[PDB]
Amino acid sequence: FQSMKWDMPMAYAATNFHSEHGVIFADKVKAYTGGKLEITTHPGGSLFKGGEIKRAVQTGQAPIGERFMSAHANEAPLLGWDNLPFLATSYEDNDKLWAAAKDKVNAQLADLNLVALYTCPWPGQGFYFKKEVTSSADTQGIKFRSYNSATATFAKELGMLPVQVEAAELSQALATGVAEAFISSGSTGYDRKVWEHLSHYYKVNAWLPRNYVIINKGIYEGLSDDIRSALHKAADETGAACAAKSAELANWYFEQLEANGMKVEDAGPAFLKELKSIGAKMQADWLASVGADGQAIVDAYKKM
Numbered sequence: 001f002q003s004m005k006w007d008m009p010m011a012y013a014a015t016n017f018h019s020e021h022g023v024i025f026a027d028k029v030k031a032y033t034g035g036k037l038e039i040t041t042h043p044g045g046s047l048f049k050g051g052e053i054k055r056a057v058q059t060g061q062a063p064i065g066e067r068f069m070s071a072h073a074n075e076a077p078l079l080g081w082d083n084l085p086f087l088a089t090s091y092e093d094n095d096k097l098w099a100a101a102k103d104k105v106n107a108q109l110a111d112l113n114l115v116a117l118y119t120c121p122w123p124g125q126g127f128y129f130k131k132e133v134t135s136s137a138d139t140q141g142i143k144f145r146s147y148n149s150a151t152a153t154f155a156k157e158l159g160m161l162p163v164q165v166e167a168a169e170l171s172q173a174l175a176t177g178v179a180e181a182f183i184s185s186g187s188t189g190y191d192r193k194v195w196e197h198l199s200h201y202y203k204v205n206a207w208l209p210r211n212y213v214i215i216n217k218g219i220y221e222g223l224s225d226d227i228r229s230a231l232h233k234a235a236d237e238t239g240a241a242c243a244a245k246s247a248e249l250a251n252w253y254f255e256q257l258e259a260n261g262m263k264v265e266d267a268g269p270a271f272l273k274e275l276k277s278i279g280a281k282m283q284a285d286w287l288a289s290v291g292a293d294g295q296a297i298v299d300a301y302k303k304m
């Protein structure tokens, strides 16, 4: 029996729900192609690290992969749509925002030699610290782990000192004092056992950024018709299942952080007001960088 074999690099822990859904996707592709396409995922950055996956897929070093594409918004600012703070703070609203951004993002991805087969939101983003934080007076000079330009910008507005670290390297960065604070979901704090190093999480749910499963555009264009439709069928089903799993686990992760000794609370009123002011500035900066396209996306979203 003849079959194509593809390696699919992914950046997050093997037991993170995104990675598990990569395997679900591969199983569906194998079934729906009658065995003709067998995908093996490589989670945890074990084949290509997170910072390498986009280029690997663009050049065909890997045919398919998963990447958190807002970590490439410096090259393509439209990819920052999913880090606009306080714009879409629920799963339902994030789906509407993706619906408003999809055509423009698909066009931008094509210009980068990529096709996104499915995407999936992480849970809402909040702040991890090693101490109580009630205002930006408490955050001045704290070393911070960013995961993209938007989180680095947010950190700088709070007077923190950001450096980018991929999730697979986050535990060691915390253990060695590279950072004492970061923005992420409850999911990544759990997967990286961050209670070993930090004490507080503030549940802001400021945005729901997405992973994307991307395929090399030349490979996609050259696939047999049946293989291509099977990939899309598998992708649609996986994207639905992954987003359901993400939402089902969101609050469970918080309970796990608490069970391991962390203080998990909403941001205080003074702190939240600062975060919302910074978020408005970041949304204005994004709109200036993307221009009319950004105005169109936000308007289309608000009409839904």
Ligand SMILES: O=C1CC[C@@H](C(=O)O)N1
Binding pocket: 068, 122, 123, 147, 166, 167, 183, 184, 185, 186, 187, 188, 209
């Ligand atoms: O919730 C999230 C967003 C990206 C990823 C991270 O911290 O790297 N976890």
Ligand SMILES: [Cl-]
Binding pocket: 252
């Ligand atoms: Cl569970």
